Design a binder for this molecule. Structure first.
Ligand SMILES: Cc1cc2nc3c(=O)[nH]c(=O)nc-3n(C[C@@H](O)[C@H](O)[C@H](O)COP(=O)(O)OP(=O)(O)OC[C@@H]3O[C@@H](n4cnc5c(N)ncnc54)[C@H](O)[C@H]3O)c2cc1C
Ligand SMILES: Cc1cc2nc3c(=O)[nH]c(=O)nc-3n(C[C@@H](O)[C@H](O)[C@H](O)COP(=O)(O)OP(=O)(O)OC[C@@H]3O[C@@H](n4cnc5c(N)ncnc54)[C@H](O)[C@H]3O)c2cc1C
Lengths: 330, 330
């Protein structure tokens, strides 16, 4: 039981941002990350992933992302930037540490690791991202589908789907991007709930910040190859594929689920903080939990801050959260 | 679809060992392993772990463990041995791969990975170990225990336990060794289903191969500090500890469950192969499945060969299982 003013749970860009401001405050604190290496959920994105904005529009507080040389920074660059960032600021990051549980300890909070290490914190900033909680919807007959199934979370490479009939389900950025790539080797069907919405060709992801899906080069190359049409969801799944309410069938060898994530919040279960919808109720700042005021949330998505779940978006909230925690411990 | 005669699932000692024999046979095969590195489950063991036998009693088929300089090999040396081993025999090991499921595909076996990679196999050898299914029993009152719990699986170091009252539950080698070490910083209580059985001070784990707990140096030291005394199981747990049958109460800050493991066979689900006891129905060999004669099982433990879940004792079964698969493919 090291006592610290603030425990930051998660050491991705979100935790790193919190850590940038906690440095500039009086407070003692620690960043606890489960990964083997720095870079957060980026270590788990497919090989070809680039960001949808230039380096300069993908920097977190203070030291900006080094200059990269394409239009858009490669996966490896985010990784490197995140790791250099930790050093530059000598951020107190402990990794690998899986936090099992945050629980009550009087006015403070006890943070417990899978291996028995413990902190006692006046405040906790939960910054554990969404990747660990990949969401797959529930469709009739799905368990009797005989082909291949993976989430976008585990998508890596197009080679495995070569020569197949593949269904890509979900119309976010992941769908459009995975569809783009996989379709260069497989017959592809894009299955989306709503007609997929595209930003203009002459604009990138920065537009989301200044405020649906970005025309990055592979996606542009896909529109040209005539592959970006969607179909609405089937009524159910058969062993060999899907069926629509109008009777229509399609066989598929594989299905790639691009149907989103939820907050990785299993470490706050039993604090009664997690809503049914996989969130937590927050005050008007969007950052401090209603039910337990010692607990802050950072980076999760719009429900937690408009555009908080992006590299450029996170900064605002990081500063805001840390100013509220700074006041709180004085 | 990559076709091979044999897919070996799992790349610890057990999978390396089958690898050795499959190399000497003429079959085409591959070894799929989930970890980030070679070394199987040794990677995930506490810092102080040493083997309970000398290098030469901890060698797998063919190339013996390099000579270690203390009485027993350090964890590091096991990792280095298994790593050097794969190199020396150029074994076809792919890592990380997580095999999600095995399925009937016509004559043969489809092996599917979390990212959609797919082998096609006439024969499968499941060598996935036990570490991934840590076992913790159910105990009345437990869900209210308000202190730290963790399994021997995630035990790292003693510092987390200094000053605590700790229960160590399980009378294997894990209980004895975790107990030895933790009681140098904590007021300890060892809780065991049966009188624990010790081998003679003047002998080591080779005696389990020649057919219970080994007097390894830390354990010897523990017996002398007068801490190797078991107590029987409690009747219930409360929020602060445990209660025994005769009403006695003992408070605890932490419990370390060293209550054993089960086979890691979630990849064999939906093949009617995994028993309610978590095992597989084997033939008189102990190796070949009844329900699917094209699945062999290797390394898991007594039910799967006598001293099969040890370094020295897997070799025999390894050779045996490859013999049966060579023949099966003819
Ligand atoms: C496919 C994909 C493409 C994207 N494209 C872009 C883009 O172009 N530009 C952009 O700005 N954003 C993009 N995003 C959104 C992006 O901002 C990421 O989601 C980013 O990873 C979120 O930052 P984070 O630090 O909150 O997430 P993470 O990187 O998930 O956060 C860090 C995580 O905390 C650790 N953790 C979780 N639980 C625990 C626990 N219980 N105990 C200890 N540690 C724990 C995780 O291991 C650690 O890595 C993309 C996201 C995805 C998924
Ligand atoms: C604390 C402890 C001390 C021990 N002491 C000794 C000792 O002193 N001497 C001795 O001889 N033995 C000892 N043992 C037994 C020992 O042999 C280990 O159990 C050893 O790890 C077993 O080797 P294995 O290759 O069968 O299992 P592992 O080493 O666990 O097996 C390898 C595993 O297969 C992979 N795998 C599992 N599922 C999948 C999947 N779906 N897809 C891909 N890969 C998968 C795992 O990631 C990979 O590492 C000890 C065990 C423990 C737990």
């Amino acid at each position: 039981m090291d006592s610290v003013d603030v425990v930051v749970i998660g050491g991705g860009q979100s935790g790193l941002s919190a850590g940038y401001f906690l440095r500039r405050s009086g407070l003692s604190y620690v960043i606890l990350d489960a990964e083997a290496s720095p870079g957060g959920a980026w270590q788990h994105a497919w090989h070809s992933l680039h960001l949808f904005s230039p380096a300069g529009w993908s920097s977190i507080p203070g030291w900006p992302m080094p200059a990269s040389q394409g239009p858009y920074p490669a996966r490896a660059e985010v990784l490197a930037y995140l790791a250099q960032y930790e050093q530059k600021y000598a951020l107190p990051v402990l990794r690998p540490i899986r936090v099992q549980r945050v629980s009550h300890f009087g006015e403070r909070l006890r943070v417990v690791a899978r291996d028995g290490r413990q902190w006692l914190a006046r405040a906790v900033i939960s910054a554990t991202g969404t990747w660990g909680e990949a969401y797959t919807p529930e469709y009739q007959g799905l368990e009797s589908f005989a082909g291949i199934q993976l989430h976008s979370a585990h998508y890596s490479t197009p080679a495995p789907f070569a020569g197949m009939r593949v269904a890509i389900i979900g119309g976010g950025n992941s769908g459009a991007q995975i569809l783009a790539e996989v379709s260069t080797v497989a017959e592809t069907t894009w299955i989306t709930q709503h007609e997929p919405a595209f930003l203009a060709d002459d604009v990138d992801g920065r537009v989301l910040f200044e405020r649906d899906i970005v025309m990055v080069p592979p996606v542009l190359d896909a529109r040209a190859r005539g592959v970006l049409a969607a179909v609405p969801p089937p009524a159910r799944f058969s062993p060999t594929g899907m069926q629509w309410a109008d009777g229509t069938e399609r066989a598929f060898d594989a299905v790639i689920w691009c149907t989103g994530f939820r907050p990785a919040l299993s470490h706050l279960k039993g604090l009664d903080l997690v809503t049914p919808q996989g969130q937590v109720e927050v005050d008007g700042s969007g950052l401090r939990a209603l039910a337990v005021p010692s607990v802050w949330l950072l980076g999760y998505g719009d429900w937690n801050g408009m555009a908080s779940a992006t590299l450029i978006g996170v900064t605002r909230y990081a500063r805001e959260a840390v100013r509220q925690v700074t006041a709180y411990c004085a």
